[PDB]
Amino acid sequence: AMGSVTVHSSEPEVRIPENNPVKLSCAYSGFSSPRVEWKFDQGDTTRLVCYNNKITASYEDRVTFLPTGITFKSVTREDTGTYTCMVSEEGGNSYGEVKVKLIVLVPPSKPTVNIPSSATIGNRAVLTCSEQDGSPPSEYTWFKDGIVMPTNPKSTRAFSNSSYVLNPTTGELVFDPLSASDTGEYSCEARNGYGTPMTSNAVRMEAVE
Template sequence: MGISMFFVLCSLTGCLALSKVILHADRPFLRVRFMDPAFLKCCYEGVPSNLIWYRQNDSSKAHLVTILDRVEEKYSKNENVHCSNLTFKFVLLEDIGMYQCLLNDTGVLTHGTYMQVYKPMEKTINLSENTKNTILTVEGFLLLLCVLLPSATLLLKSRSLERLEMKKVRQEEENIYQGLNLDDCCTTYDQIERSQAQGPYQDVGNIVEEKEEIQLEKP
């Protein structure tokens, strides 16, 4: 019975505290370049309360924000709206985390803002725009040469191969008639003509005696 009453009283106390305070929406995310300034703000409506800034890093541990030379905190009020402004003159990598305001009188935490600090990529070679344009022009010219030179080389090779092929064909045609003797050709031709003009050969097995003797050529 006593424990249940304790939880009821705690819930009633929290409800009363929230009823006195109306939190304004915080900026959920802030990305800042390394060594640049940054501005955080938390606002609420209600009874004035002492605000304390907390930072929760990746290790899930909340740390009290220390006001240093590069970190300033200022309060502002507009009618019933109270705000706490946290200003970084320049941010470091160690400033990364979730920033929330704690209202001491009510124990309420604001929604908070996650601040991310990044380092831009540094140029390894610092070149001017004219130098970059010149380099791009030279690269385009070299690329054009890389395309044209192989094509011209292949074209010249194909033409030289075509000339060699034609020369080879002419040499083969000349070699056909190179070893021929015209006298031998005439003798062979005469022998062929004489063999066609002469009569048939004598067949020894079929000899027929006739009145008129036929002169046959012996093989």
């Protein structure tokens, strides 16, 4: 006795920041005695949020349950993952699955930087930025005397005599050769599109021959 069924979610990609409650919708139809279950997924971790129309152990405190979805009370950057609703028909004639994606927003924190005081004119010169609390991740913006770093060193700018390489997601800034011209107060802001972007410590650097 297979019936023609449906399982979908108004919000295929939810987004909300830390601590606020949030509902995850899952509207299904075609089912006479359905068994709804939610499961969690991120990286290699996978644990059930709802099992047997009941919310599992680890969530009852915060996570409530409905024919239409799971409502929370608060979240954390732990909950950032893909939620998979799963409706089956008792006995198992029919079965469907909506896959909702959650992003828990966390503004970026101050980036730690390792600009070194000096480096020799000519050899490689690795500097860095990183932050690690902002969700989504940080995109980094290098400065020099406060004048934003052109991801492109060559071409028109003013920077076209500098030998660097940037990386908006590693923050790794790498000179090669290092030039006398590169002496400057370096820094970097980290923005993830959320909250306010944090700027690191400006660190002067001198090219010593």
